[PDB]
């Protein structure tokens, strides 16, 4: 199962989210523009 807002890739993060890297990574909101 995909990755949520608050943990990293992978699990690929779910639909709506993407990648956010960083120490530690962890995925964002792509549609999240606030």
Do not use: F, T, Y
Not at 4 to 33: T, V, Y
Request: one cysteine or more; proline letters at 9%; glycine letters at 18%.
């Amino acid at each position: 199962a995909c990755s949520g807002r608050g943990s990293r890739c992978p699990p690929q993060c779910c639909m709506g989210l993407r990648c956010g890297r960083g120490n530690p990574q962890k995925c964002i909101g792509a549609h999240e523009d606030v």
